[PDB]
Amino acid sequence: TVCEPLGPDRPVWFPGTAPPPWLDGSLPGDFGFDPLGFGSEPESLRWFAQAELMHGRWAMLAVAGILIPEILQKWGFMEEFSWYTAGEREYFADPWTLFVTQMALMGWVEGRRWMDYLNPGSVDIEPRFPNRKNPTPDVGYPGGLWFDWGNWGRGSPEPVMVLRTKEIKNGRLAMLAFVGFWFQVVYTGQGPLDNLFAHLADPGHCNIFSA
Amino acid sequence: MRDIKTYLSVAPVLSTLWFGALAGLLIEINRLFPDALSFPFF
Amino acid sequence: EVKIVVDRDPVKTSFEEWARPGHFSRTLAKGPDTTTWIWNLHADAHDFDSHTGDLEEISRKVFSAHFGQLSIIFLWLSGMYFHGARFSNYEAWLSDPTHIGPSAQVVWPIVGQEILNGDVGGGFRGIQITSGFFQLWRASGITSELQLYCTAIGALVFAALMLFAGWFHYHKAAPKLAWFQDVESMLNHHLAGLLGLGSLSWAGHQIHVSLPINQFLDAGVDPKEIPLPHEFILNRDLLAQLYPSFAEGATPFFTLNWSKYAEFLTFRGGLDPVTGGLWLTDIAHHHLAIAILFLIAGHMYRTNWGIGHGLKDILEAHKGPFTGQGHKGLYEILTTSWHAQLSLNLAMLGSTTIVVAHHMYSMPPYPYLATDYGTQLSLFTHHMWIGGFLIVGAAAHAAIFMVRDYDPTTRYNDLLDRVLRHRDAIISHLNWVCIFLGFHSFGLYIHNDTMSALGRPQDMFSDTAIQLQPIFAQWVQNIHATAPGVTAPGATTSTSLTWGGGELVAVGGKVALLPIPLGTADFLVHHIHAFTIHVTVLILLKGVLFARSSRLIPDKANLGFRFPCDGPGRGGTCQVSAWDHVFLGLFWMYNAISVVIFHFSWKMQSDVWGTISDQGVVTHITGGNFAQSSITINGWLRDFLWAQASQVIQSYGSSLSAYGLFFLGAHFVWAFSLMFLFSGRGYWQELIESIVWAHNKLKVAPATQPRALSIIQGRAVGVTHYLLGGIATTWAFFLARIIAVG
Amino acid sequence: RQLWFASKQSLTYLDGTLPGDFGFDPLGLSDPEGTGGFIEPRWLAYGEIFNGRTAMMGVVGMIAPEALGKVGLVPPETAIPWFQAGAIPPAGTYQYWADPYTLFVFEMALIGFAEHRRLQDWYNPGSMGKQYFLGLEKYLGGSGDPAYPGGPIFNPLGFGTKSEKEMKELKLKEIKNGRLAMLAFLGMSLQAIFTGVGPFQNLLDHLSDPVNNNILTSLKFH
Ligand code: CLA
């Protein structure tokens, strides 16, 4: 736990501006950007931090699942066609069965996680053979060799706050990427790589303003 | 922030949202069961 | 002199207060010990002058409130333009507007209301409208849904901008006193700046966009290939093709030989048979001349320089023998009390709304407007209602000023002093005039009805019997019909067609306007109007003049503006506050407006509106029985009220069926009002007491102690419900009848 | 203070604070009874400086291409009036190294970067030389006053050697040239809106034929 208070250690998102006082910069990925001041009170602050982390991780997974199969279609062996139209793809089972199974299992898991949030340490999975003392928690970073078997979130590979900063920044970027992909498919009728190459060929004209 | 929460807990806005939700439920039921005169379940 | 002085950031945009209701009132902020608290909260929210004692803060508050109002108006305009864009048949309507009903509202097919989306023609289904936007959108050459769409967007932008401006000007940069209190520059601008330049820019938009596209549409073209507006200003050759003079740039104007432009700026008058509307050349000349007039008017008062008058330097000179010192000091009164200004402006605005209502029907400005019957009728009656309400508000706020902020020690005057010094004479003579008019304008109807039901028709009041002739009105009509001969050579016909001379204008087998004759029935109805107006004036003027102190209660003013009574003493003192005077006058204003609008409907549907045959024979919508059936109340029942109420009552199971349903609820509320207007309070208090007992027995007695409404609020809810019932009844009646038959 | 059409509300605040006060303001805007935001006299001098500078650059640039085309060697591919270059679609256009619209929003974003940073400096002077900027940090402190930034990035050759008088001259020169360029730009644009042929060709005209005098015609056309 390292703090990033005002000064050179605090590169303000808006140069020449004093960041909101209740934005200390402890949470990695902070730059003093909350003009709406939603993080005014601490309970809301931590709640929004958890929401941000979850959104970032899910958005990373979603953008990977969009990107990789489409390029492996374009040039790779197997041809995974339009992902936006894969939502209605036909499988062995009906979409509602898939939906209810997803909801059951994810409700189980996310409910256990919800109780962990409301009551830290009271719902954890970390066995204890004798004489080896286990690690604690920092909710949002469960620890133990279930979700950190590489021993990366604790020390050695990088000071923690730096790696969490990497994570939150990449997650914000991935959120932008997902909303961009979706909005493009709303407007255009291709995948992300197709729009990409179309822009590469004609950067000067092949844009949103092409029509 | 908490001020806007206590403000949102003031009866006008709470009542408006509650009534909107109830009316939406009723109109959706009517959509999924047109003219619904009797109780043809038992 | 005058500068830009303001102040910085009085109040911070903090939600600290929104969770604490009634922060403004010290008593209200304590807590709701009972239930009357939540009535009193809304009841005094906007009461700014009872929240401070200095005019600076309330002036800032009203400055922000005006922005709120303007934001709401802009949002409404945006909604209108949107619903015209995405949900209307406007293009099909433009294709041919003779027999295609303007519809601009569809309803969702959920609960059987699909029938609401009735047949309106042009391959469309939707609730028919009567707002009359379509004549405007055809005047301004919209002729494309893209234009409505982008206009709605721009309106939304302006709305958000105004809301911002509001927030900023109250919270961040609050204006100061020497800005507000400086009325000289405000008059100067608003005269020259707002109105003048407004009409000028509109004349611009008309001569450079509307006029050519409208002339093309009158020539008859599908608006698809009609040249776009900007392509009429960029390439000059189009307008050149239209108007030779218009291809001469700007030399004929600057060089003072303006007559060259005579083609598109002219003084024809009359109406345009192609659409019955006004010759857009005329309306353009009008708007432009008005712009110039306002601009030359705006330069009156000294503001910073050495030229110009001062509103203090104008009054004090006027001082006649009878009145004495004249208007000395009045400038201070009308600059130190907002309520005075609110009253004056509300009165003038109500009068202007009424005169707009009048001038509308008799001189249809828009094209294809005098042939969409329901639109004309509904517009006229709406404007009449708005004017009436504004006038009553003017009187009420004048009374409020008389109570609170009037004082001779510092806000002195020698004119109002005299006026108040002989109030009794004024009220007495107005009362006697009211009695006289009531008798000789209603007893005439009573006599006529009686002598009818007694089989003595040749002793009636009509043209076929003992005769009363409105000679002055026919005199004026003759003058207006013979004036374009000598007095106004520059004109072509009479100023309108309703003057008793000329021909008739009919489009699509229907007539739009023609001469209007006046029979004895018109004399009687005019005197009824005069009487009812005099009585409303009596009520409101008595309230204002006696708001300070009456010969019944000596110190009424000390008891405040709005209080229920002064106890049952001295034989009973119910309804003595000016507030109750306004409560009374409201009903009489309602009655005046109701009889006026009924008269208008009958006269139009019996002497002007209707259809024209192929040969040219006219068969009016109702058969022209006015001059023979408006002179008996029993007639009003039979010929007009009963008969023309058919289309609303058979309306079930049709598109118009909605107009049917209201026709009952309108009546119902109308009933309901009596329950509050007749009863008192103590009875309801005891009943509420017994109900509280019945609940408390079950451990349900709420801490928000139930309380029957206070007296004044009872009267208020009663009068509101009554006005709602009456206006909704006449509204449903009018719409159903006219849109079904017409 | 060469008085040309002054007033007293001018002299209420125009007490000689701007370099070379001439005393010309009938209206009396910046009266300091209540200081209007962006009506501050400091902000007024700032605005005149910035506007005049931009106008100098614009009057050079808008006229440069076609003019040079006359007896010069910039090709006739761009022999086009500034008001016909393409900025005014009802006049002309050109096929460029991008499309029109995205080009405009891109240059808008760049100018926005520059002027946003300059404004942030205006509010808090010197406060740009704190944050990481991939270099450039040890230069953007300026010369204190946002009016006059200085700095070897904006002071390459080196003037005002050991002086404020030399700065006063150079600087009067600044205000005079700014106002002159403003006049010339406005005139070129008005001719363009009323003549319709282009400034440099208007010089081509007014070198020989005196009888032109097109205020006599007042012909208003595209
Ligand atoms: C990571 C951000 C990102 C990136 C790299 C792109 C890239 C692209 N978009 Mg795109 N887009 C984005 C976000 C992004 N978008 C978002 C958030 C939206 C929702 C509004 C859209 C909506 C959108 C539409 C509707 C269309 C594109 C299209 C395109 C392609 C042509 C460029 C163009 O005309 O659009 C320019 C894109 C925008 C104006 C969107 C603005 C939003 C982004 C975030 C701008 C901010 C820049 C970013 C933060 C800085 C770079 C970060 C990182 C990449 C280094 C191009 C491959 C077009 C296409 O399909 O290609 C043929 C197209 O029709 N975009």
GROMACS .gro file of N, CA, C and O in nm, chain A residues 7-8 10-18 31 202-210, chain D residues 95-102 105 116-117 119-120 123-124 127-128 130-133:
model
  168
    7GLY      N    1   0.124   1.668  -0.603
    7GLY     CA    2   0.260   1.701  -0.638
    7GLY      C    3   0.305   1.632  -0.765
    7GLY      O    4   0.223   1.586  -0.845
    8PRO      N    5   0.436   1.624  -0.786
    8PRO     CA    6   0.487   1.550  -0.903
    8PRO      C    7   0.446   1.404  -0.904
    8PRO      O    8   0.423   1.347  -1.011
   10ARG      N    9   0.173   1.314  -0.843
   10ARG     CA   10   0.033   1.321  -0.884
   10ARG      C   11   0.026   1.391  -1.020
   10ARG      O   12   0.003   1.513  -1.026
   11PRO      N   13   0.047   1.318  -1.129
   11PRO     CA   14   0.025   1.379  -1.261
   11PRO      C   15  -0.123   1.399  -1.287
   11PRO      O   16  -0.195   1.303  -1.315
   12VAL      N   17  -0.169   1.524  -1.277
   12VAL     CA   18  -0.311   1.552  -1.283
   12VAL      C   19  -0.363   1.529  -1.424
   12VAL      O   20  -0.300   1.570  -1.522
   13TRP      N   21  -0.478   1.463  -1.435
   13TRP     CA   22  -0.540   1.441  -1.565
   13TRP      C   23  -0.568   1.570  -1.639
   13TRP      O   24  -0.581   1.569  -1.761
   14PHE      N   25  -0.577   1.682  -1.567
   14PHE     CA   26  -0.603   1.813  -1.626
   14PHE      C   27  -0.493   1.906  -1.575
   14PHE      O   28  -0.503   1.960  -1.464
   15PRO      N   29  -0.387   1.926  -1.653
   15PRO     CA   30  -0.273   2.004  -1.606
   15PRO      C   31  -0.313   2.141  -1.554
   15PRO      O   32  -0.406   2.204  -1.606
   16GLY      N   33  -0.243   2.187  -1.451
   16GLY     CA   34  -0.272   2.315  -1.391
   16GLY      C   35  -0.396   2.319  -1.305
   16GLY      O   36  -0.451   2.427  -1.282
   17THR      N   37  -0.441   2.204  -1.255
   17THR     CA   38  -0.562   2.197  -1.174
   17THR      C   39  -0.536   2.119  -1.047
   17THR      O   40  -0.465   2.018  -1.048
   18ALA      N   41  -0.593   2.166  -0.937
   18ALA     CA   42  -0.587   2.095  -0.810
   18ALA      C   43  -0.695   1.988  -0.807
   18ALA      O   44  -0.813   2.020  -0.822
   31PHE      N   45  -0.618   0.962  -1.112
   31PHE     CA   46  -0.555   1.083  -1.162
   31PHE      C   47  -0.630   1.208  -1.118
   31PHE      O   48  -0.601   1.316  -1.170
  202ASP      N   49  -0.758   0.353  -4.693
  202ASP     CA   50  -0.796   0.492  -4.719
  202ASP      C   51  -0.809   0.564  -4.585
  202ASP      O   52  -0.920   0.585  -4.535
  203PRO      N   53  -0.697   0.605  -4.525
  203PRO     CA   54  -0.707   0.683  -4.400
  203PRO      C   55  -0.772   0.818  -4.422
  203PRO      O   56  -0.847   0.865  -4.336
  204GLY      N   57  -0.744   0.882  -4.535
  204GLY     CA   58  -0.793   1.016  -4.558
  204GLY      C   59  -0.944   1.025  -4.573
  204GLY      O   60  -1.004   1.126  -4.538
  205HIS      N   61  -1.006   0.920  -4.625
  205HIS     CA   62  -1.150   0.932  -4.651
  205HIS      C   63  -1.232   0.821  -4.586
  205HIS      O   64  -1.343   0.848  -4.540
  206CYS      N   65  -1.181   0.698  -4.580
  206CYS     CA   66  -1.261   0.588  -4.529
  206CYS      C   67  -1.272   0.599  -4.378
  206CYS      O   68  -1.192   0.541  -4.304
  207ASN      N   69  -1.371   0.674  -4.332
  207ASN     CA   70  -1.388   0.705  -4.191
  207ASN      C   71  -1.538   0.705  -4.160
  207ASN      O   72  -1.619   0.657  -4.239
  208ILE      N   73  -1.575   0.759  -4.044
  208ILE     CA   74  -1.716   0.780  -4.014
  208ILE      C   75  -1.776   0.880  -4.111
  208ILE      O   76  -1.891   0.865  -4.156
  209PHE      N   77  -1.699   0.982  -4.149
  209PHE     CA   78  -1.745   1.085  -4.240
  209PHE      C   79  -1.740   1.041  -4.387
  209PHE      O   80  -1.750   1.126  -4.476
  210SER      N   81  -1.724   0.911  -4.414
  210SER     CA   82  -1.718   0.862  -4.551
  210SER      C   83  -1.852   0.869  -4.623
  210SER      O   84  -1.855   0.854  -4.746
 1090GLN      N   85  -0.909   1.872  -5.398
 1090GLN     CA   86  -0.886   1.735  -5.352
 1090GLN      C   87  -0.753   1.730  -5.278
 1090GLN      O   88  -0.647   1.752  -5.337
 1091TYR      N   89  -0.759   1.700  -5.148
 1091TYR     CA   90  -0.646   1.712  -5.058
 1091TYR      C   91  -0.594   1.575  -5.018
 1091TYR      O   92  -0.634   1.472  -5.072
 1092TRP      N   93  -0.503   1.575  -4.921
 1092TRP     CA   94  -0.439   1.453  -4.872
 1092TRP      C   95  -0.519   1.389  -4.759
 1092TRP      O   96  -0.463   1.312  -4.679
 1093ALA      N   97  -0.648   1.419  -4.753
 1093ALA     CA   98  -0.746   1.359  -4.663
 1093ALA      C   99  -0.883   1.404  -4.712
 1093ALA      O  100  -0.895   1.468  -4.817
 1094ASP      N  101  -0.987   1.371  -4.637
 1094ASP     CA  102  -1.117   1.428  -4.670
 1094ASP      C  103  -1.136   1.559  -4.594
 1094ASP      O  104  -1.061   1.589  -4.501
 1095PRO      N  105  -1.234   1.641  -4.634
 1095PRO     CA  106  -1.252   1.770  -4.565
 1095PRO      C  107  -1.280   1.758  -4.416
 1095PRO      O  108  -1.205   1.813  -4.335
 1096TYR      N  109  -1.386   1.686  -4.378
 1096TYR     CA  110  -1.441   1.698  -4.243
 1096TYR      C  111  -1.344   1.647  -4.137
 1096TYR      O  112  -1.316   1.716  -4.038
 1097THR      N  113  -1.294   1.524  -4.154
 1097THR     CA  114  -1.203   1.468  -4.055
 1097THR      C  115  -1.079   1.554  -4.040
 1097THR      O  116  -1.025   1.569  -3.930
 1100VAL      N  117  -1.182   1.838  -3.801
 1100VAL     CA  118  -1.191   1.800  -3.660
 1100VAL      C  119  -1.052   1.768  -3.605
 1100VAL      O  120  -1.024   1.795  -3.487
 1111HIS      N  121  -0.601   2.505  -2.493
 1111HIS     CA  122  -0.639   2.459  -2.361
 1111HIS      C  123  -0.521   2.469  -2.265
 1111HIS      O  124  -0.535   2.517  -2.152
 1112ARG      N  125  -0.403   2.423  -2.309
 1112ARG     CA  126  -0.286   2.436  -2.224
 1112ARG      C  127  -0.255   2.582  -2.195
 1112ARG      O  128  -0.224   2.619  -2.081
 1114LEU      N  129  -0.464   2.834  -2.186
 1114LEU     CA  130  -0.563   2.886  -2.093
 1114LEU      C  131  -0.537   2.838  -1.951
 1114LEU      O  132  -0.548   2.915  -1.855
 1115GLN      N  133  -0.508   2.709  -1.935
 1115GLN     CA  134  -0.473   2.657  -1.803
 1115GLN      C  135  -0.356   2.734  -1.744
 1115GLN      O  136  -0.354   2.764  -1.624
 1118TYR      N  137  -0.500   3.075  -1.612
 1118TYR     CA  138  -0.555   3.065  -1.477
 1118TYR      C  139  -0.444   3.056  -1.373
 1118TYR      O  140  -0.433   3.141  -1.284
 1119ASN      N  141  -0.360   2.953  -1.383
 1119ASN     CA  142  -0.248   2.935  -1.290
 1119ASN      C  143  -0.117   2.957  -1.365
 1119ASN      O  144  -0.069   2.866  -1.434
 1122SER      N  145   0.216   2.714  -1.410
 1122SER     CA  146   0.177   2.581  -1.363
 1122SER      C  147   0.180   2.475  -1.471
 1122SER      O  148   0.130   2.365  -1.445
 1123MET      N  149   0.234   2.500  -1.590
 1123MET     CA  150   0.252   2.393  -1.687
 1123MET      C  151   0.385   2.320  -1.668
 1123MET      O  152   0.399   2.207  -1.716
 1125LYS      N  153   0.511   2.153  -1.434
 1125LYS     CA  154   0.511   2.054  -1.327
 1125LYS      C  155   0.488   1.913  -1.378
 1125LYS      O  156   0.561   1.821  -1.339
 1126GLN      N  157   0.389   1.893  -1.463
 1126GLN     CA  158   0.348   1.759  -1.500
 1126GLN      C  159   0.438   1.701  -1.609
 1126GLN      O  160   0.503   1.774  -1.685
 1127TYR      N  161   0.441   1.568  -1.615
 1127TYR     CA  162   0.511   1.498  -1.721
 1127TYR      C  163   0.454   1.536  -1.857
 1127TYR      O  164   0.332   1.535  -1.876
 1128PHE      N  165   0.542   1.570  -1.951
 1128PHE     CA  166   0.499   1.611  -2.084
 1128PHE      C  167   0.588   1.552  -2.193
 1128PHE      O  168   0.595   1.606  -2.304
   0.00000   0.00000   0.00000
